[PDB]
């Protein structure tokens, strides 16, 4: 489980 | 080339419907993103003649997606609240599309394993996809809560405050309240992890409509289904990089309007009357 993210 | 023989036989909407019927496919995982709801009239962040885009300008963001950042919300809540006022995502404004009604039909046919949506528009729910079968992986505007202590807040109060220019505040800690949209940096709901660990590994078919693959962990869903099951992508863009090959040949990309493609799929599935009937009944 990890939090909502995006690679920027 | 033999190594290109497709798991679907013919990698077409016709072949897909045949495959579903001939193999009696009952465990269909449907994933849904922003492309599915364009036809409902949802304002695209990225479109220059929208009201939503005009707003974002003054603030100057290295991405419309920073409006959904938890750290920007704590710092300058006026920014997300200003976007919330313009998107009109409160339930009961937008109506479900042909894609949304289709998923409801899959459920009523006993073929839906789970519907997992990254949209925050509540349209799957508006189309009658049941609670046990629907995962709103990024929440929606249906309920609200404090971001500091997680205490629920009246959505009706939050709506009235937001739409009149007021940032809502927790009556326990003075924290900032927002609708229960999952922001960048927040936890996804449990039901997302249920779907990832328990549904996707047993899918017989995955149909991925209008999604990006660039928001995580949501984008893992189609990566964890069995290596042999068909993965159908309906999108206006060639998405997924090298994770998709449009190990057996099992991926297909259907370009064009996902609303039209679902209607065609429905025809071949023998569901065209049920779909036209849902579509009239609420447009
Ligand atoms: Zn609080």
TrEMBL record, chain B:
Domain Deacetylase sirtuin-type: 6-272
Keyword Zinc: yes
Keywords from the UniProt entry: Glycosyltransferase, Metal-binding, NAD, Transferase, Zinc
Protein name per Swiss-Prot or TrEMBL: NAD-dependent protein deacetylase
Co-factor note (free text): Binds 1 zinc ion per subunit.
Residues engaged in binding NAD(+): 44-46, 118-121, 211-212, 235-237
PANTHER family noted in UniProt: NAD-DEPENDENT PROTEIN DEACETYLASE SIRTUIN-2, NAD-DEPENDENT PROTEIN DEACYLASE SIRTUIN-5, MITOCHONDRIAL-RELATED
Active site: residue positions: 138 (proton acceptor)
UniProt GO MF annotations: glycosyltransferase activity; histone deacetylase activity, NAD-dependent; NAD+ binding; zinc ion binding
Its EC number(s): 2.3.1.286
One Pfam family hit: SIR2
Annotated Gene Ontology cellular component terms: nucleus
Family label: Belongs to the sirtuin family. Class I subfamily.
């Amino acid at each position: 489980r990890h939090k909502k993210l995006m690679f920027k | 080339a033999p190594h290109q023989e497709h798991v679907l036989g013919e990698p077409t909407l016709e072949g897909l419907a045949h495959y579903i019927r001939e193999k009696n496919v009952r465990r269909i995982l449907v994933l849904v993103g922003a492309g599915a709801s364009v036809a409902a009239g949802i304002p695209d962040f990225r479109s220059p003649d929208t009201g939503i885009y005009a707003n974002l300008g003054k603030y100057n963001l290295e991405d419309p997606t920073d409006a959904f950042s938890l750290t920007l919300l704590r710092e300058k809540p006026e920014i997300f609240y200003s976007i919330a006022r313009e998107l009109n995502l409160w339930p009961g404004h937008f109506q479900p599309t042909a894609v949304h009604h289709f998923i409801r039909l899959l459920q009523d046919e006993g073929r839906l394993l789970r519907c997992c949506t990254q949209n925050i528009d509540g349209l799957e729910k508006a189309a009658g996809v049941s609670p046990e079968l629907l995962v709103e992986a990024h929440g929606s505007f249906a309920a609200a809560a404090c971001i500091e202590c997680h205490t629920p807040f009246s959505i009706e109060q939050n709506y009235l405050e937001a739409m009149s220019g007021t940032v809502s505040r927790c009556s326990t800690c003075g924290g900032i309240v927002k609708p229960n949209v999952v922001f960048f940096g927040e936890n996804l709901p449990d039901a997302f992890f249920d779907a990832l660990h328990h549904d996707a590994p047993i899918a017989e078919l995955v149909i991925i409509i209008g999604t990006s693959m660039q928001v995580h962990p949501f984008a893992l869903l189609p990566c964890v289904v069995p290596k042999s099951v068909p993965r159908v992508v309906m999108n206006r863009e060639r998405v997924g990089g090298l994770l998709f090959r449009f190990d057996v040949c099992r991926d297909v990309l259907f370009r064009g309007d996902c609303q039209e493609n679902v209607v065609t799929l429905a025809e071949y599935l023998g569901l065209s009357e049920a779909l036209a009937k849902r579509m009239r009944l609420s447009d």
